[PDB]
Amino acid sequence: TLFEVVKLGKSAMQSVVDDWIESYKQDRDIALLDLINFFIQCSGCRGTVRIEMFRNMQNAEIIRKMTEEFDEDSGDYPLTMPGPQWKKFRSNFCEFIGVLIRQCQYSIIYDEYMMDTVISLLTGLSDSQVRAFRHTSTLAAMKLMTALVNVALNLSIHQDNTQRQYEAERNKMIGKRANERLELLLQKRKELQENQDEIENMMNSIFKGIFVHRYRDAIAEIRAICIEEIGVWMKMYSDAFLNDSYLKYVGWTLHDRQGEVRLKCLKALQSLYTNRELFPKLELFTNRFKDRIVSMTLDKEYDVAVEAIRLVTLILHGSEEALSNEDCENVYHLVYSAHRPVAVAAGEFLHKKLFSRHDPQAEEALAKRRGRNSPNGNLIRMLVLFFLESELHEHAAYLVDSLWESSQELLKDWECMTELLLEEPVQGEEAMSDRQESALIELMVCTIRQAAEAHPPVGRGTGKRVLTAKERKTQIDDRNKLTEHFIITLPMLLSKYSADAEKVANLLQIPQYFDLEIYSTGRMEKHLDALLKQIKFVVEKHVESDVLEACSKTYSILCSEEYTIQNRVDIARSQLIDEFVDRFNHSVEDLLQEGEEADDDDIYNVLSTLKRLTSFHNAHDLTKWDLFGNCYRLLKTGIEHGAMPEQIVVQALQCSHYSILWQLVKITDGSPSKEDLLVLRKTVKSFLAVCQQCLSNVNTPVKEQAFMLLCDLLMIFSHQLMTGGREGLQPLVFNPDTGLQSELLSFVMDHVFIDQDEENQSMEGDEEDEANKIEALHKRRNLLAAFSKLIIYDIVDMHAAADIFKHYMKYYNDYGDIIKETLSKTRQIDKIQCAKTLILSLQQLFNELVQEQGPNLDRTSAHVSGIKELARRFALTFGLDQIKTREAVATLHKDGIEFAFKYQNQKGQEYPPPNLAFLEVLSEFSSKLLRQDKKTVHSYLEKFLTEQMMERREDVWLPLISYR
Amino acid sequence: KRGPLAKIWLAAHWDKKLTKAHVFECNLESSVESIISPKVKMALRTSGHLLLGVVRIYHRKAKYLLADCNEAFIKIKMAFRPGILQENDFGDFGMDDREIMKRKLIVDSVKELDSKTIRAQLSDYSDIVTTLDLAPPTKKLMMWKETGGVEKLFSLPAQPLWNNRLLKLFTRCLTKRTQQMLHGLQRALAKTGAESISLLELCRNTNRKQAAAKFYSFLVLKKQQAIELTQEEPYSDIIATPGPRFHI
């Protein structure tokens, strides 16, 4: 029971190896029988070899008999059964072969007895048609010959030692005992020579009998295992295996059609590089198969791509010859891979390759920094140039993430490119180009944001991140050093780049990652205030919405009341908003009157000031300066006149909404009054009238903004306002208007559910520019999402959302996610009414079909097929999933039956029902999901039918037949 | 180790692990003495050790209270009025200690591919090749992708809400040899019956050692008051006659 002893938890593998050695010394036949029985029961054959049947009759008929006597209960074999107990079985099996053959290498392995039978049986079973026998025999003989390779290595070392001692004696001819030692060494050398010849004989026998047959085998895993292990051997025994005689098989196997075999080929090739260099035949094969290696860089499997990139890195360690510049740019594009390990491997290769200004990839004192503020400048320089040439990305986020861990020491040396950006270093280089300036600033944005937060961006995200102590302490002192460095650098950074809008927008994302109590410890609030005045100059010099958003977000980050500086920053915030209030009042009180003219200058001043006010009012409570009077006067004169720019109205509407929501903030504070409550409700009602007028206004972005503002107003006054333990907010609650609901539905249908260019309510996007179709599609998805969010929270009538549910196939790619989620949520809110509106959606589509085609309805057309497919996916959306499972199905069936006989035919004939093809739609909802309620639904169905309708069975009433 | 009396065990026996925290307030002395007064199975020496513990801790409270009074003394007294070869051995002579010494089994009709498939693999291998999964070039592609999804988009406002407080408002809407000699004399008397036993007669045919043993035997029998021995002149044979405890 050596199979069971090795399998079922062997305490010491060398112990049973020595037991087999002792039994072999006792009697060769019984130990050979035990080893053969072990191998056969390792093959999955439950037959047991006996003494006479092993001794007398040959191995091929043994193989035939055990094929007949396999005695299976399943097709599985011990190399593929689930895991644990069998995994450690396989490991024990391999270790038993290795230790058993390697331990006998001194005296037992030259008896010329066991290996003949073992080789014959294993070769025959590797030529056997049974996959189990082939796999098990290949593994057994494969570990056998691996052990024989180790024995050959030991014999070669012994030959080297005895040759050295023979030459050492041949130096010294003095001594008769020395001559006797020389003759003993010669006899030992001859014994080792004949032992080596025998080992070579069994080596060649096993090789030409097994490996040549089984690397052409139809099983991928046998070839993969063979190639991986042959690379292991050629890594460890390069004396005889490092030649083309074994590399021809590797070259032939590199073109395998299976990913795992090629993975093992790349592992073998890396084993030729790891960890020793250099060999000429290795570089010859590298230059021979550079094209195949770069082919595997773009393989389907991510693992094969990673191994190919690592082999390329190994070649760069060893050769620097075979790789071409186009291959280099291919890997530079692989830096932008979606899969993070591939990108990180490519970035590590890039760091190894293109960074040799003063680092020779060698020892220090000239490699990291030469004690000056200059050596690392050129590394920064081809970072900038690489970002310039990499036109596959406007941002170096993926590039920096790939180059993060490989260049950790280089990416924290922010002071170096800081002097190479602002203060004109002593290197005598050219002027820092504006495109290069923006590229370097984008690189800094990426590097410091990855310095603060360590999570990779979206697509590279994992969510299974754990922070070690080293990680968190590196994060903290990294935060400290960036804080103290950049509170110094940002003042003259802004002073150099005040007028550059995009550079300011990029630079003001870092202060989200600044520990503000360090200012209290560092006493650098004065530099904070200098940067506040500098960004005040930017704000008063820039009118861009994006930079105002960035500034407002930066202020909100530094408006952290948990830090002492909140008063000091609130000084500057109040000062700047007070300036903007004064400027807004001065400009508005002259713009609202007609006068002369109003010209473009006053329009520009009003628009810029209101942009700034709206932007800084989004993130900050500024209702102490009640400018809703000016904004509402501007909105009402926009209503009355209508001849003035769009953006001013957009800014006024958004600023008024911001004021309203900031007032809404300070009523849930536990102190609600009533006079200001009614005042706020009246202002909200006026804002609702203005928003309805703007929705009726001809301008379509104004229509969308009015729609989303109305969405915000309705969710503010939604039914879930009463959830959070509120009592006095009940007067504030305002119900939707049915005409307003119809206007909203009409707007949504005219401006959302469009997938063609015929409507012309969606901007073109044909040219692959910043004005692509994707922006319009995502904006329409956002508007539909806001509308559905109003729908699902008991605010607006969801019979209007039935018309949204009906568009699930015409807009599957565009809005199928939104329609499916809305249907699921409305099912979770009220499944009965959800099913009623679902069958209403089907009725609406069917009535559109009635309008388009008439009462014949074209029952075999694509429209009916699409409606029936929609019915199928709706029926599988139901079932036993929520409460009132079949009651909703019964209600849907009753509604469908009512609709199928809703209209009666005037001519030809009275009993044929119009809208009969809806029974085909309902037949998908009947199917076989239910069984007991089918009788009740049929009883409801037969109320509208007659016996004359029962008896007729033709093409017109085929929907009725299919439903019944 | 464990117990309300464990601290007293430490005080009695270890006394080093005690700290000021236990000394000040851990137990009331008057409480623990009345705890220990009526206890059953109390061995004498363990009671002595518990007395050690209580005496030690009581005196330690007295020392610490004395201390407390001392820093009280310091705090009450304050007030504020604005108004070469020197030392060695003679050589190393003092220091010179010296050193000393149908079938369902798997049957494969073909097990090896022909050379035609091998040559086709060598000539063409473009059927198992892809190109790349390019990352999106622009930042707006990220802020649409990570907002891409109805599980997120239905739980976030259409407009970005830069204040988390506004996000709270949004989510608010989410739901024995002496006897031998005696008997030997009993038969020795009955042979003659002359009530006079001769010492020399018994040792007529014996050596010195057994004669001395017999003499000491007569001595010890006289000691047990069982027999009366008479001898008058300084040197004669001893006459033994039955005494009170002769046992006949």
Side-chain angles (χ1 to χ4, degrees), chain A residues 127 302 336 393 395 442 789, chain B residues 111 133 135-137 139 153 175:
Chain A
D127 204 73
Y302 280 127
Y336 295 130
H393 273 78
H395 51 78
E442 183 70 38
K789 276 187 279 290
Chain B
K111 306 162 302 178
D133 45 351
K139 306 148 171 284
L153 179 46
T175 305

Side-chain angles (χ1 to χ4, degrees), chain A residues 863-880:
Chain A
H863 307 293
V864 186
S865 295
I867 292 169
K868 275 176 303 207
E869 172 53 49
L870 203 52
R872 291 166 56 189
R873 61 190 61 248
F874 283 161
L876 61 95
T877 314
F878 299 144
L880 272 55

Side-chain angles (χ1 to χ4, degrees), chain A residues 277-478:
Chain A
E277 288 154 11
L278 188 153
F279 292 104
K281 185 63 182 68
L282 173 59
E283 283 187 348
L284 187 84
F285 195 84
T286 288
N287 301 0
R288 193 170 183 89
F289 282 83
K290 190 263 302 181
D291 283 323
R292 183 59 180 166
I293 286 161
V294 76
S295 84
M296 289 298 98
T297 61
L298 307 178
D299 196 356
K300 301 195 186 291
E301 304 298 321
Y302 280 127
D303 297 330
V304 185
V306 160
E307 294 318 299
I309 291 168
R310 284 271 73 82
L311 185 63
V312 159
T313 302
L314 278 167
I315 293 159
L316 181 61
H317 179 207
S319 306
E320 301 108 353
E321 297 146 16
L323 299 152
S324 62
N325 286 344
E326 59 87 19
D327 296 321
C328 290
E329 199 59 42
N330 285 339
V331 190
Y332 298 157
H333 303 155
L334 296 178
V335 178
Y336 295 130
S337 170
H339 201 251
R340 185 161 204 281
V342 177
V344 163
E348 176 189 357
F349 151 77
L350 162 63
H351 183 92
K352 182 180 176 182
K353 173 60 177 83
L354 283 198
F355 290 82
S356 45
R357 153 66 178 81
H358 65 281
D359 187 11
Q361 313 167 336
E363 299 179 354
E364 289 186 359
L366 201 69
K368 204 164 188 176
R369 191 163 274 281
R370 308 171 56 204
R372 318 159 190 175
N373 58 6
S374 288
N376 294 263
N378 184 234
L379 305 182
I380 300 166
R381 274 175 267 261
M382 82 303 294
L383 289 172
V384 165
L385 297 174
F386 192 87
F387 189 39
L388 293 179
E389 63 90 24
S390 304
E391 215 63 36
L392 291 185
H393 273 78
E394 290 173 8
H395 51 78
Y398 299 92
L399 167 67
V400 163
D401 193 62
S402 313
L403 274 296
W404 189 246
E405 285 80 8
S406 295
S407 63
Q408 278 294 276
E409 72 281 8
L410 193 56
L411 294 175
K412 311 312 155 309
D413 202 331
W414 307 306
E415 48 271 20
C416 192
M417 73 291 291
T418 312
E419 71 273 15
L420 276 71
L421 190 59
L422 299 167
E423 54 256 20
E424 298 168 355
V426 301
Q427 298 302 94
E429 305 290 329
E430 77 273 14
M432 187 66 204
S433 177
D434 304 331
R435 199 199 162 195
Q436 286 176 347
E437 280 173 336
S438 47
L440 187 58
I441 287 168
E442 183 70 38
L443 293 153
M444 295 298 103
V445 171
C446 294
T447 51
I448 295 89
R449 63 90 174 174
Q450 198 161 2
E453 54 84 17
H455 64 76
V458 66
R460 296 174 183 265
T462 48
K464 301 181 180 281
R465 301 176 187 90
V466 295
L467 273 187
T468 76
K470 277 75 61 181
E471 279 144 27
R472 300 179 261 213
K473 65 178 72 66
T474 44
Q475 178 201 8
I476 297 299
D477 75 318
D478 189 358

Side-chain angles (χ1 to χ4, degrees), chain A residues 52 54 75 132 177 205 251 273 296 357 581 584 706 744 796 854 874 910:
Chain A
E52 295 88 45
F54 170 75
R177 296 178 176 179
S205 174
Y273 265 97
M296 289 298 98
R357 153 66 178 81
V581 169
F584 192 66
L744 284 177
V796 69
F874 283 161
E910 292 177 350

